[PDB]
Write a protein that binds this ligand. Structure first.
Ligand code: CLA
Ligand code: CLA
Ligand code: CLA
Ligand code: CLA
Ligand code: CLA
Ligand code: CLA
Ligand code: CLA
Ligand SMILES: CCCCCCCCCCCCCCCC(=O)OC[C@H](COP(=O)(O)OC[C@@H](O)CO)OC(=O)CCCCCCCCCCCCCCC
Ligand SMILES: CC1=C(/C=C/C(C)=C\C=C\C(C)=C\C=C\C=C(C)\C=C/C=C(C)/C=C/C2=C(C)C(=O)CCC2(C)C)C(C)(C)CCC1
Ligand SMILES: CC1=C(/C=C/C(C)=C/C=C/C(C)=C/C=C/C=C(C)/C=C/C=C(C)/C=C/C2=C(C)CCCC2(C)C)C(C)(C)CCC1
Ligand SMILES: CC1=C(/C=C/C(C)=C/C=C/C(C)=C/C=C/C=C(C)/C=C/C=C(C)/C=C/C2=C(C)CCCC2(C)C)C(C)(C)CCC1
Ligand code: SF4
Ligand SMILES: [Ca+2]
Ligand SMILES: [Mg+2]
Lengths: 40, 157, 729, 31, 80
């Protein structure tokens, strides 16, 4: 896995960020949100 | 509706408290974001708060000396960064502990379990363990940057 | 709990169902707690702004990835021998074999090849460099920002539009016809005349010079005088070579029909002229309705004035019926848009407009299938929202005796005659197919009932197709329809009479049989959808069904049993028939064009008559390459398509589970699992925040249909793409 | 010619604007 | 010599087709946009249709604006 396009170091960290960090964080936020029992 | 399209208001409804309710100071996003950081997240024990803060700080403190320290152009680049970050986290722990020792000499409060001698000491313990751990794991990842690169590129399968 | 905040009922649900239904009813704003009509329209307006912005950001991503990781500038040089690439691959899962297999199309890193035809589009409209695509994508970033901010602003009280503003149909129709449709088409004709057409002739026109280089040497003088023919000028010669001035003309507005000889697409000057004419007509039409100056029509008066002796009340109050029902409006929009989306699909493959896209067979197949599937979804949604109208918004007293109510009055006749036409078509098309199958099986293929589609061939002749020798209208030189001197007639005839394109493809008995299969599919899907819409208010099994809403599980096992009684269930059943219809039509298109591109039309002509020919010569054979994307011997660039083929089979079969096996069995199993958890130590330390329950009945139908459809679409897409790419037409 | 690193990074900064506006529209539509 | 090309006194295209047309356009948007049209020191009496319709200052200002518009448009349409 490489890339000859400009700034080919961006998928290197963006693919883990989009596949691991983004889903983990958004699922965690939505999880704490749908389980929130604050009245209302 | 009405006439208040205004985005700035008196802070907490008291205009004579020296503060203002602004999009940076008191928007819903900042209330939820600051209020859920380890320092303020509800119900947490101070040990976990300290652990999380220390993880973040120890992890990121390895970088400055790793890329810009005196050993950056030597065979001990990442070890130099690690040594620096560890010593810095040790000094920071001593600062945190001295703070706790001096500010909680009298009667202990009740509303804030972090704002007590026991709570601030637990915070310092968690911060020490998390800072040392984060610094050492950042160092370990950097010292084996080639295997992380091959992992992220699939150079091993 | 808080979530969902728009429903107290769901918010107090103590099971996991609360979550599911909270996801499933978010966009149904009308049934939110405390919802008013004005707040409804305002929320819809802001949601619309958000959706437009999402579209713009998607287009920005397409432009950006072509410009950053693609081969646009290289593909422009040799567009018939270079494969356009969509974006770079970055997957840490890849091994050496896949890395090698996907460094393709001249790329120096793993890459996917594009099948959206977007290279041909951007090149035809005058873009030639990556810098232009990047500037376009940044501009679309800005446009999306503008629409997002506007959506936010129109939720602010001072900028909140009133209900009467949303209900001003006359002004909005005027603006959308004259401005949204008309001035946009005018501006596009201006881009064509200013940029795309000069670019196609070797000239550069961009923001650096477009002020000081006219589209025509005469420039505006003939326009404001008589003398419009100057712009028809000398057109591009037959020897014109796209992108260069060799054989290039100077005209900007022509009407010579046919295709460009080299690019096999409509002439850019014809397209510019079309957009100018359409602009004129739409601008004129955008003055029909009354707004602020007394002149103009009231739609209400037009509808009220159209009554007959045989239609009762006519169209009386239809203005309020439609203006007060967002579901009526949405059903109309969906039906019309689905019709014209099918129209787009039928005309782009037949009369392409982008240079060299006709020789790109995988893109043609993919775009046709894409637009046809979009059309099918749009049609089903149109009828579903008609049913929702009847359930939620239909008023019997105001619509009394008009055409709308009269459609309900004789609904049994409509439903029964739809049943009869479906039975007619099914019985006899299946019978002819099975007769042909048996007769070819026993080694006597000469006994096939082969009906020549004489009517469609005769229509082709009326447009000029001389192959059949009908000699009618444009196929007869003596015809008054052909002795007009129409400037388009020579080019149109030259295009339609060469067997080298997809302009009115020659047809035979196979086309007859598949067209009746298509008629059966359309009629049966329409029958399901219309029976659901007309019985949504009530039948004899459920004379009070309107009290139960559009979607509900059932009415219980009593009164004979009432599984799938709601009109939502009619939508859900009709989805299967839509997918079946689109399977038939895309099989037809793909196999016929496989023959066309391969030159071997005899295969489809002689084997599309019996269904075993469809089984082996279309499905079984064209899988060979696709299925060998990965094997014990190695891997090629078809590996993704093989794995996606299997993935779709799996998702489809998985949906079978929700469709076939119903709910109570799962609730009992989940109760055993709940007991197993509550009694397993260490695991006992943890407890669920929501009580686990089986998926609801409607939820089951929907989830099973979703798996069915995902698997359907992905399976066929992988097959189509991999077969056409491995064979290369 | 080929896009530059500066052009790629400049587009991400620009995209920060639709991100903030989409966040604002989302949170307001939640109201 | 690299100089933007203007036009010699066309006196068919340069006049009414641009200059007088831009002046009429300025007339129109001033008629529909000036808050105080006839509140000038100078009445310049006979209120008419457009040429000298509301006030001397309205006339003079909208005419100066029409000349700005016409200068810009003539120069632009003649290259730059
Ligand atoms: C059909 C009408 C028409 C046509 C098409 C043209 C055509 C043209 N005009 Mg003209 N113009 C017109 C009407 C027209 N004009 C009218 C009615 C006026 C009167 C206001 C003008 C006055 C005008 C001037 C003064 C100039 C032109 C210029 C030009 C040329 C500009 C080339 C260019 O890209 O600019 C440049 C492109 C840019 C992106 C530059 C923008 C960057 C600036 C410097 C930012 C500055 C910000 C500023 C300080 C903020 C304003 C302060 C506050 C008021 C907000 C062009 C061929 C220029 C010219 O003739 O060139 C020789 C020029 O100097 N026009
Ligand atoms: C909606 C359009 C769109 C789509 C579908 C993609 C798709 C992809 N991009 Mg790209 N990107 C886009 C727009 C888009 N991009 C734009 C406009 C830019 C310039 C700002 C970039 C800059 C960018 C970089 C630098 C990289 C990718 C990469 C990738 C790939 C991995 C995913 C990723 O890391 O993205 C990350 C995306 C960003 C950091 C920027 C956000 C993209 C836009 C602005 C937001 C899209 C929001 C969307 C419309 C919300 C709707 C979602 C819907 C389900 C509700 C993936 C195939 C990686 C790649 O090339 O793989 C090899 C890579 O490293 N993108
Ligand atoms: C003088 C200022 C300065 C300097 C010079 C550095 C220097 C450095 N930083 Mg730092 N940083 C700074 C300030 C600074 N930082 C500040 C102010 C912050 C905000 C508080 C950060 C926060 C930050 C973070 C969060 C990270 C760095 C990292 C780095 C290193 C990355 C460069 C590299 O070697 O490539 C190589 C980079 C990597 C191999 C990173 C690995 C890929 C990570 C894990 C992303 C994948 C996310 C994924 C979801 C995690 C999976 C776990 C789980 C959730 C599934 C580098 C030595 C990275 C690092 O320490 O590397 C270990 C890192 O992760 N910086
Ligand atoms: C011989 C007795 C003794 C020994 C073995 C230690 C050992 C240790 N102490 Mg402690 N300490 C002591 C007495 C002692 N302490 C007393 C009497 C006090 C009250 C004033 C403290 C208050 C203190 C604080 C507030 C902290 C420590 C901490 C630590 C650890 C960090 C390493 C270090 O500070 O360097 C070795 C130290 C010595 C060889 C000298 C020990 C005797 C002096 C008087 C200690 C003075 C503490 C000083 C303010 C903090 C040092 C700063 C740091 C940068 C080294 C370490 C294992 C830190 C820690 O991580 O705790 C969890 C920290 O936060 N100590
Ligand atoms: C000239 C003034 C004008 C214009 C430009 C618009 C424009 C628009 N309005 Mg608006 N409107 C106006 C006046 C105007 N309006 C007035 C005065 C009122 C009050 C009476 C309204 C009230 C109103 C409401 C309440 C709403 C809109 C909405 C919309 C948007 C419709 C959705 C859309 O984006 O489809 C764009 C459509 C086209 C570009 C043309 C249709 C294309 C046809 C169908 C076929 C395609 C042709 C061609 C083959 C395409 C090529 C394909 C390409 C990929 C190659 C649209 C951008 C809706 C919206 O989304 O809000 C944000 C909405 O909710 N309008
Ligand atoms: C184009 C305009 C349009 C508009 C704005 C609406 C608007 C609406 N519809 Mg409608 N409808 C439309 C088109 C439209 N629809 C179409 C095209 C169809 C045919 C499919 C339908 C059929 C229909 C029915 C039968 C119903 C509605 C309903 C509704 C309402 C509730 C929406 C909701 O919350 O559901 C939220 C939606 C979901 C939770 C499901 C999302 C499914 C996603 C997009 C597909 C998943 C794909 C999968 C994950 C892909 C995996 C890929 C991977 C394997 C590689 C809402 C007001 C419902 C209603 O309330 O009735 C009044 C209702 O019962 N619609
Ligand atoms: C290959 C599978 C298949 C077949 C053959 C049918 C058949 C039919 N469906 Mg159906 N459907 C299917 C799958 C299928 N469906 C699926 C998966 C769904 C989603 C659940 C639906 C949901 C559905 C709905 C909602 C509706 C239909 C309708 C119909 C009828 C339409 C009229 C017609 O086709 O003309 C004529 C019929 C036929 C050609 C089929 C009969 C074929 C036999 C072989 C004829 C000979 C009789 C035979 C010799 C009997 C002797 C038996 C003996 C030897 C043991 C038809 C009987 C519509 C309807 O009822 O029409 C009024 C309707 O409303 N279908
Ligand atoms: C391809 C085959 C299509 C299959 C469709 C179904 C076939 C069954 C035949 C339907 C008979 C319906 C009986 C009506 C009952 C009936 O006779 O009512 C009597 C009605 C007389 O009412 P009036 O016209 O006086 O009413 C005045 C109007 O303002 C209100 O309708 O006559 C008609 O409506 C003739 C039109 C019926 C045909 C329906 C139109 C179908 C296609 C429309 C094409 C539109 C083209 C527009 C282009 C400008
Ligand atoms: C003074 C004035 C006039 C002179 C006007 C002059 C002198 C110039 C006007 C130029 C204009 C009005 C340019 C308009 C450009 C509009 C565009 C460019 C609109 C939309 C672009 C979109 C929506 C996105 C397109 C996409 C992009 C970005 C891509 O890169 C891929 C394709 C696609 C996705 C389509 C005249 C005398 C005439 C009338 C009197 C007033
Ligand atoms: C983007 C953004 C932002 C920012 C952010 C930041 C600035 C951050 C950074 C981040 C970080 C900074 C992170 C981190 C991470 C860390 C970690 C993850 C850690 C760790 C550690 C460990 C794991 C350790 C371990 C251990 C121990 C503990 C002991 C023994 C030894 C060892 C090492 C094993 C915000 C949201 C604001 C806003 C928006 C945008
Ligand atoms: C349920 C419902 C509904 C409905 C829905 C839907 C979905 C509908 C539809 C429908 C459809 C989907 C239709 C279609 C159609 C078509 C047509 C009507 C056509 C026409 C045509 C013509 C007329 C043509 C002609 C021609 C030709 C053929 C060729 C040459 C040229 C010419 C032009 C001559 C609503 C909501 C409304 C209401 C409520 C209920
Ligand atoms: S089987 Fe299910 S859907 Fe049918 S009646 Fe019983 S509960 Fe209702
Ligand atoms: Ca150019
Ligand atoms: Mg076309």
């Amino acid at each position: 896995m490489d890339g000859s396009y400009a700034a080919s170091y961006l998928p290197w960290i963006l693919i883990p960020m989009v596949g691991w960090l983004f889903p983990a964080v958004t699922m965690g936020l939505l999880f704490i949100h749908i389980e929130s029992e604050g009245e209302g | 509706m009405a006439e208040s399209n205004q985005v700035v208001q008196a802070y907490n409804g008291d205009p004579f408290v020296g503060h203002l309710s602004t999009p940076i100071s008191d928007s819903a996003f900042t209330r939820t974001f600051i209020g859920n950081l380890p320092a303020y997240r509800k119900g947490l024990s101070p040990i976990l708060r300290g652990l999380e803060v220390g993880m973040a700080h120890g992890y990121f403190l390895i970088g400055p000396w790793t890329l810009l320290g005196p050993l950056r152009d030597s065979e001990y680049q990442y070890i130099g960064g690690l040594i620096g970050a560890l010593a810095l986290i040790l000094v920071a722990t001593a600062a945190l502990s001295s703070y706790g020792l001096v500010t909680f000499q009298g009667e202990q409060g009740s509303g804030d379990t972090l704002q007590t001698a026991d709570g601030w000491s637990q915070f310092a313990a968690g911060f020490f363990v998390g800072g040392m751990g984060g610094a050492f794991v950042a160092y370990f990842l950097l010292e084996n940057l080639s295997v992380v690169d091959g992992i992220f590129r699939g150079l091993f399968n | 709990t808080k979530f969902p905040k728009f429903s107290q009922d769901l918010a107090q649900d103590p099971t996991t169902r609360r979550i599911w239904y909270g996801i499933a009813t978010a966009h149904d704003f009308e049934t939110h707690d405390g919802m008013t009509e004005e707040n409804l329209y305002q929320k819809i307006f802001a949601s619309h702004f958000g959706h437009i912005a999402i579209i713009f950001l998607w287009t920005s991503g397409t432009l950006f990835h072509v410009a950053w990781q693609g081969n646009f500038e290289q593909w422009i040089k040799d567009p018939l021998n270079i494969r356009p690439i969509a974006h770079a691959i970055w997957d840490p899962h890849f091994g050496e074999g896949a890395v090698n297999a996907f460094t393709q199309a001249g790329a120096s890193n793993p890459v996917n090849i594009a099948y959206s035809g977007v290279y041909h589009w951007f090149y035809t409209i005058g873009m030639t460099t990556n810098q232009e695509l990047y500037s376009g994508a940044v501009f679309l970033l800005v446009l999306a920002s503008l629409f997002l901010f506007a959506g936010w602003l129109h939720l602010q009280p001072k900028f909140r539009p009133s209900l009467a503003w949303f209900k001003n149909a006359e002004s909005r129709l005027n603006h959308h016809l004259a401005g949204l449709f008309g001035v946009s088409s005018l501006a596009w004709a201006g881009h064509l005349v200013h940029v795309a057409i000069p670019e196609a002739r070797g000239q550069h026109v961009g923001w650096d010079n477009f002020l000081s280089t006219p589209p025509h040497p005469a420039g505006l003088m003939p326009f404001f005088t008589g003398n419009w023919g100057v712009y028809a000028a000398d057109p591009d010669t037959a020897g014109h070579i796209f992108g260069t001035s060799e054989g290039a003309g100077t005209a900007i507005l022509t009407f010579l029909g046919g295709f460009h000889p080299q690019t096999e697409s409509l002439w850019l000057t014809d397209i510019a002229h079309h957009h100018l004419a359409i602009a004129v007509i739409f601008i004129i039409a955008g003055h029909m309705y009354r707004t602020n100056w007394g002149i103009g029509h009231s739609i209400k008066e037009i509808l009220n004035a159209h009554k007959g002796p045989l239609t009762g009340a006519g169209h009386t109050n239809l203005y309020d019926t439609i203006n007060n029902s967002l579901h009526f409006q949405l059903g109309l929009a969906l039906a019309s848009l689905g019709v014209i989306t099918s129209l787009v699909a039928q005309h782009m493959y037949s009369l392409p407009s982008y240079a060299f896209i006709a020789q790109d067979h995988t893109t043609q197949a993919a775009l046709y299938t894409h637009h046809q599937y979009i059309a099918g979804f749009l049609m089903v949604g149109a009828f579903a929202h008609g049913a929702i109208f009847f359930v939620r918004d239909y008023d019997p007293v105001a619509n009394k005796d008009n055409v709308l109510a009269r459609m309900l009055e004789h609904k049994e006749a409509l439903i029964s005659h739809l049943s009869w036409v479906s039975l007619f078509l099914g019985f006899h098309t299946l019978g002819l197919y099975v007769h042909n199958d048996v007769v070819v099986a026993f080694g006597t293929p000469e006994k096939q009932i082969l009906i020549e589609p004489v009517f469609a061939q005769w229509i082709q002749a009326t447009s000029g197709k001389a192959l059949y020798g009908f000699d009618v209208l444009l196929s007869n030189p003596d015809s008054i329809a052909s002795t007009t001197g129409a400037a388009w007639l020579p080019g149109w005839l030259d295009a339609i009479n060469s067997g080298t394109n997809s302009l009115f493809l020659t047809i035979g008995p196979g086309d007859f049989l598949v067209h009746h299969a298509i008629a059966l599919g359309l009629h049966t899907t329409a029958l399901i959808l219309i029976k659901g819409a007309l019985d949504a208010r009530g039948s004899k099994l459920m004379p009070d069904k309107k009290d139960f809403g559009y979607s509900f599980p059932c009415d219980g096992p009593g009164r004979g049993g009432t599984c799938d009684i709601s009109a939502w269930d009619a939508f859900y059943l009709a989805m299967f028939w839509m997918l079946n219809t689109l399977g038939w039509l895309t099989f037809y298109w793909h196999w016929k064009h496989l023959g066309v591109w391969s030159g071997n039309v005899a295969q489809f002509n002689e084997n599309s008559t019996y269904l075993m020919g469809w089984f082996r010569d279309y499905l079984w054979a064209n899988s060979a390459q696709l299925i060998n994307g990965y094997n014990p011997y190695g891997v090629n660039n078809l590996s993704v398509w093989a794995w996606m083929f299997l993935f779709g089979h799996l998702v489809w079969a998985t949906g079978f589970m929700f469709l076939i096996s119903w709910r109570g069995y799962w609730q009992e199993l989940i109760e055993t699992i709940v007991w197993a958890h509550e009694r397993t130590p260490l695991a006992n330390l943890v407890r669920w925040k929501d009580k686990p329950v089986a998926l609801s009945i409607v939820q089951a139908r929907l989830v099973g249909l979703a798996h069915f459809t995902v698997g359907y679409v992905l399976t066929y897409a992988a097959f189509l793409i991999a077969s056409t790419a491995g064979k290369f037409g | 010619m080929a896009l530059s690193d500066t052009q790629i990074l400049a587009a991400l900064v620009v995209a920060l604007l639709p991100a903030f506006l989409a966040f604002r529209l989302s949170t307001e539509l939640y109201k | 010599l690299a100089q933007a090309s203007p036009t010699t006194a066309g006196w068919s295209l340069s006049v009414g087709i641009i200059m007088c047309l831009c002046n009429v356009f300025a007339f129109v948007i001033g008629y529909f946009a000036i808050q105080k049209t006839g509140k000038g020191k100078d009445l310049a009496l006979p209120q008419l249709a457009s040429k000298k319709t509301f006030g001397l200052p309205e006339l003079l200002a909208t005419m100066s604006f029409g000349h700005i518009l016409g200068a810009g448009m003539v120069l632009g349409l003649a290259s730059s």
